């Protein structure tokens, strides 16, 4: 047979036109190689496995996220959208709410429905299409202009998500619990469709009210079926009845977010913990609907009183803003705060309404503290990057202190970039708090770092920038959110208003009302909260007179307030440091910040010292600290050494915020002040970090391990190091790769990759040996990742003659637990040799298939390894493009397998050997193995026929 385009396409149809979820990744890789011009006639065919649209979309996205244009992604997107429109054109014309309890009310409808979703010939295609649609919608936020979802398909996608949740709930009513993947796909489409503004403008309109109440009814019924046993309620203390039902159901759900859907609560133990994030996000996005938003923001304790106006909002449920004479009661105020903080604000008018409300409450014992906290959180709400008042879409905007590394954007740097982005992707997926992420998709993590030149900065450009003091994946407000350089850079401050909402007026009003409120018998618990609110809002101050007023207020407060506060200093010190170091810390007045820091670092209780360290980090940001009057440096370094030498053997005992901020300060000192932070000062903590990274999984928590390790990776990657502690750093990296925890092994592997790519003969062989050992005795995740980074490591460190024996020896082994990965490693290596004109070394090594191959007790595995090897060492396309097909069958000695193996070996014998004496040398190895059995004897016959 001629192994050509048509043979290949037939072989692709043999695996990607069934209905089976065995080898979906390899199926996507096989469809990838189909000609781009003839790919959509291949996926829009009625037999196509619809379970491949998620792997095809993921592979296309990984090809586009790599910059290159992807045609498989275009095909999979076209097919997903066409299939969605198709499966939506079957639903009945008019839509009735899906009262998941009302006994079949629209009989005809509720029967024309069952006939279209009670059967498995269509219902089975709803979640396998929802998986594709959720894999598409989760990456529309990072696509080009012509790859977003069109404006025409938005109504159809809303109807499809409605129908998918309706079908899932119908299954739950009649049949048993659908499936974990079906549930997940339906809720994923729901969440990701209410997360996009293009579809949020369609669901939340007026002709889609029945669909909104269907979503609400179905989500409530699913939460009831999943989270509670039959016979109990969710919580443990005119117009279409369904509208009021929807209002009350969303109110109950929002009230549940505190207990039943709070991950780790004593009541969330009923939800299977893979539905908690999806349901939280869906409930938030539903509560923000204009239909139910007006009702949802009113606490229940208001209806428990005599409040019941006559509403109207084109639905009949637009209630007015709570009369502030109700919030003077505490519990009602705390519930209102919870509603407006969890839900955020849906528009500028709503921000202004709740602003004026909390102002009227702000004018009294403790209502003032609650009002101040609500106010500061409310102004911080406009800080978020993606969509400003949307807690489902957005997270708090942070500009890190660390500048982009200059070692990258080089020759070796741009290769370390790739091979460390891989390891970082996996460390993200394996240890990140998926806090800004709701769905299950792994390779989706992003960071809230908008450019200060704006559009969000792509995550693969933030390798070692994100302040090494915040937990990997944690997006809450951390003290030190916005760096001071960012303050000088965004609004040009010599050392406007936020999204849709005038924050200059809010900031100025708050600054005047705070200054006039703490300088002259205000209680202590009020002064401390005003200072905390000032520190938190000073992330939104724009002018320099705002910061100067803040500084003069805070220093007069320091002078007036007594020293016996201990709970005011935690916010007095970092706020004063932020102000004084935005003013370009000078000698005249911004100098006695060093005295304040020196005094607060010898404190008695920890939070004052953590605040002092955040203030120190605020100063060095780009102040000439002190002004070459840096006499704070010796103090900072002595404190850091004395209090990190103790907390290095037992770390889980001491607080984690303290250790994290101490490490962040130490790394900033070593990298930015390497001539004042003494010399060995680095090595000293490159030992503290050694005694911390080398601890057992109990003696070193995971987040502290990953900070210290990523900070060390930056310290080495930044050229601000002597070659004496860097030499002390290349040794520590290798002792941590042979660890049991897979994510710790992956972190140590990333540090080793930087130790190798930055500081640049048998050492390289020791390192490749440890990599092969992590393939051979690791978990499938870690082993797949290491085998995915290995081809580049190999082709970039040592010439192919050195390791070509080792790669084949690790492929052909009995101690090899995952030969299905080493197949791809050998493939990448050989196909790299077929580009650099070294296609003669590869044949020299394949002619070394005498004893290594053809000698493997499971003859099935012997012929499988022979087929993998002869596919790898093939200069022909359509033969090298079937390795995903041969990896999908690691045993399975069928007859078509043998036909494949004979064809592949015949192609090799015809195209690569070309030497008759070597041809006979090749022929007289199947005769020793002989095997009159099918595989070799058929190969010998076909070779005699050639």
């Amino acid at each position: 047979v001629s192994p050509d385009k048509d043979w290949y396409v037939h072989l692709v149809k043999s695996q990607c036109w069934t209905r089976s979820d065995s080898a979906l990744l390899e199926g996507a890789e096989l469809v990838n190689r189909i000609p781009a011009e003839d790919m959509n006639a291949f996926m829009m065919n009625s037999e196509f496995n619809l379970s491949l649209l998620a792997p095809c979309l993921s592979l296309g996205m990984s090809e586009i996220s790599g910059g290159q244009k992807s045609a498989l992604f275009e095909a999979a997107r076209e097919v997903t959208l066409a299939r969605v429109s198709g499966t939506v054109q079957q639903l009945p014309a008019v839509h009735h709410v899906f009262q998941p309890e009302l006994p079949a009310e629209p009989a005809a409808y509720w029967s024309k429905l069952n006939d279209l979703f009670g059967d498995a010939a269509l219902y089975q295609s709803l979640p396998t299409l929802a998986r594709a649609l959720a894999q598409y919608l989760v990456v529309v936020s990072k696509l080009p202009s012509h790859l977003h979802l069109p404006p025409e398909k938005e109504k159809d996608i809303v109807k499809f998500v409605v129908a998918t949740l309706e079908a899932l709930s119908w299954h739950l009513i009649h049949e048993q619990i659908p499936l974990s993947l079906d549930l997940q796909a339906g809720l994923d489409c729901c969440c990701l469709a209410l997360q996009l503004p293009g579809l949020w403008s369609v669901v939340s309109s007026t002709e889609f009210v029945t669909h909104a109440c269907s979503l609400i009814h179905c989500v409530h019924f699913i939460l009831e079926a999943v989270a509670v046993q039959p016979g109990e309620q969710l919580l443990s203390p005119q117009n279409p009845k369904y509208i009021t039902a929807a209002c009350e159901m969303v109110a109950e759900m929002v009230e549940s977010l505190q207990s039943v859907l709070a991950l780790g609560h004593k009541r969330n133990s009923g939800v299977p913990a893979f539905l908690t994030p999806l349901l939280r996000n869906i409930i938030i996005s539903l509560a923000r609907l204009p239909l139910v938003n007006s009702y949802t923001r009113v606490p229940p304790l208001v209806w428990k009183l005599g409040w019941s106006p006559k509403p109207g909002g084109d639905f009949g449920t637009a209630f007015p803003e709570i009369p502030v004479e109700f919030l003077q009661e505490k519990e009602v105020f705390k519930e209102f705060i919870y509603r407006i903080n969890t839900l955020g604000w849906t528009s500028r008018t709503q921000f202004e309404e709740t602003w004026a409300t909390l102002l009227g409450v702000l004018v009294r014992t403790q209502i003032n503290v609650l009002a101040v906290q609500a106010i500061t959180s409310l102004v911080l709400s406009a800080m978020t990057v993606p969509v400003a008042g949307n807690p489902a879409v957005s997270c708090l905007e942070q500009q890190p202190r660390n500048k982009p590394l200059k070692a990258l954007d080089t020759r070796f740097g741009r290769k370390l970039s790739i091979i460390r982005g891989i390891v970082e992707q996996e460390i993200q997926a394996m240890v990140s708090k998926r806090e800004n992420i709701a769905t299950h998709h792994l390779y989706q993590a992003w960071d809230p770092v908008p450019s200060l030149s704006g559009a969000l900065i792509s995550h693969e450009k933030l390798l070692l920038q994100i302040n090494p003091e915040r937990e990997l994946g944690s997006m809450s407000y951390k003290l030190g959110q916005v760096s001071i350089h960012s303050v000088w850079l965004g609004n040009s401050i010599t050392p406007k208003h936020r999204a849709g909402v005038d924050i200059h007026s809010c900031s100025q009003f708050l600054l005047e009302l705070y200054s006039r409120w703490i300088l002259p018998r205000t209680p202590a618990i009020l002064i401390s909260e005003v200072v905390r609110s000032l520190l938190v809002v000073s992330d939104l101050f724009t002018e320099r007179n705002q910061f100067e007023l803040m500084y003069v207020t805070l220093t007069e407060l320091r002078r007036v307030h007594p020293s016996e506060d201990e709970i005011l200093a935690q916010y007095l010190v970092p706020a004063t440091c932020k102000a004084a170091a935005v003013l370009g810390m000078d000698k005249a007045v911004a100098e006695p910040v060093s005295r304040l820091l020196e005094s607060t670092l010898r404190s008695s209780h920890l939070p004052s010292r953590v605040g002092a360290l955040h203030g120190i980090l605020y100063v060095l940001e780009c102040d000439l600290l002190d002004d070459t009057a840096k006499q704070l440096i010796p103090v900072i370094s002595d404190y850091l050494l004395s209090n990190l030498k103790g907390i290095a053997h037992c770390v889980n005992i001491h607080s984690q915020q303290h250790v994290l901020v101490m490490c962040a300060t130490a790394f900033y000192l070593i990298e930015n002040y390497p001539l004042d932070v003494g010399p060995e000062f680095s090595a000293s903590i490159i030992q503290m970090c050694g005694v911390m990274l080398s601890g057992s999984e109990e003696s070193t928590p995971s987040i502290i391990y990953h900070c210290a390790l990523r900070g060390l990776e930056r310290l080495l990657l930044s050229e601000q190091l002597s070659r004496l502690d860097a030499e002390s750093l290349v040794k520590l990296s290798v002792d941590r790769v042979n660890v049991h925890s897979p994510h710790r092994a992956m972190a140590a592997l990333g540090l080793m990759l930087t130790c190798m790519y930055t500081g640049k003969v048998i050492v390289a062989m020791e390192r490749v040996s440890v990599l092969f050992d992590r393939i051979r005795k690791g978990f499938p995740c870690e082993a797949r990742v290491v085998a995915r980074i290995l081809p580049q490591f190999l082709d970039d460190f040592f010439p192919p003659q050195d390791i070509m024996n080792k790669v084949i020896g690790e492929f052909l082994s009995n101690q090899q637990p995952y030969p299905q990965f080493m197949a791809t490693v050998v493939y990448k290596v050989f196909q790299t040799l077929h580009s650099t004109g070294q296609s003669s070394m590869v044949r020299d090594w394949v002619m070394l298939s005498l004893s290594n191959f053809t000698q493997r007790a499971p003859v099935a595995m012997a012929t499988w390894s022979l087929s993998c090897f002869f596919v790898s060492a093939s200069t022909s396309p359509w033969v090298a493009a079937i390795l995903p097909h041969v990896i999908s069958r690691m045993g399975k000695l069928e007859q078509v397998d043998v036909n494949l193996f004979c064809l592949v070996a015949t192609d090799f014998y015809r195209h690569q050997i070309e030497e008759e004496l070597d041809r006979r040398a090749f022929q007289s190895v199947l005769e020793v193995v002989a095997a009159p059995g099918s595989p070799y004897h058929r190969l010998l016959t076909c070779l005699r026929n050639v």
Binding site: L25, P178, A273, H605, S741
Partner: protein, 234 residues
């Protein structure tokens, strides 16, 4: 310092769960480390090991409520260690909570190392009626975790080898499990080891009523790792 614990935890539970405050310094936790985390050590150094760990059982539950699963798991395990060689049931409940938190942290090889410790303490101390309620959760958990991780034969302890061996037709028996759950577990082990998707899907749909929420999470994870493996980058 035990009612001060209530004060300084509610002063954090307010801003976290009651009135969600997306403006938290993170201030009352680094201080929540006092009283609780503080006497946690004081109780020991002066001596009250019996109830000393109860303070940590409250502080760990608080930490898990706030969204710190890993440190909550650490404190839970420490409590289990503190109460162990005097009270089996207390430390077994603590270890169960620690395994739950570690599964919240997506730390599977550390959760399996606690399930194996429970399962092996329940036996060597089952010499009641709840021991054969931890041996029925730990066995199913451990099997689902070993099916999710899939360790290679090299780094696979004798314990896990014995367990994953118990559930193939070379073996029939039920130990402490109910017969139907054992048959489902055996069919699931045999179907996953033989790269069978539809069998595992049918088994997920059939087993959902018999498994708890944690183990249903784990069975969904097994099914997902089977369908779309984690590490390919796509």
């Amino acid at each position: 310092l035990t009612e001060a614990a209530r004060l300084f935890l509610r002063q954090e539970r307010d801003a976290r769960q009651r009135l969600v405050c997306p403006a938290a310094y993170g201030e009352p936790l680094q201080a929540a480390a006092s009283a609780l985390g503080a006497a946690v050590r004081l109780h020991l150094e002066l001596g009250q090991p019996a109830a000393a760990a109860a303070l940590c059982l409250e502080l760990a539950a608080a930490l898990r409520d706030l969204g710190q699963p890993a440190a909550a798991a650490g404190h839970f395990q420490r409590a289990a260690q503190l109460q162990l060689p005097q009270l089996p049931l207390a430390a077994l409940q603590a270890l169960g909570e620690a395994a739950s938190c570690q599964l919240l942290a997506r730390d599977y090889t550390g959760a399996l190392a606690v399930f194996t410790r429970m399962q092996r303490l329940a036996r060597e101390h089952g010499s009641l009626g709840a021991f054969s309620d931890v041996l029925v959760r730990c066995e199913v958990s451990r099997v689902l975790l070993l099916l999710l991780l899939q360790p290679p034969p090299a780094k696979l302890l004798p314990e896990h080898a014995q367990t994953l061996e118990k559930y193939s037709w070379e073996a029939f028996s039920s130990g402490q499990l109910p017969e139907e759950l054992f048959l489902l577990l055996q069919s699931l082990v045999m179907a996953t080891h033989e790269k069978d998707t539809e069998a595992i899907k049918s088994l997920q749909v059939e087993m959902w009523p018999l498994l708890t929420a944690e183990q249903n999470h784990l069975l969904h994870l097994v099914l997902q790792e089977t369908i779309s493996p984690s590490g390919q980058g796509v």
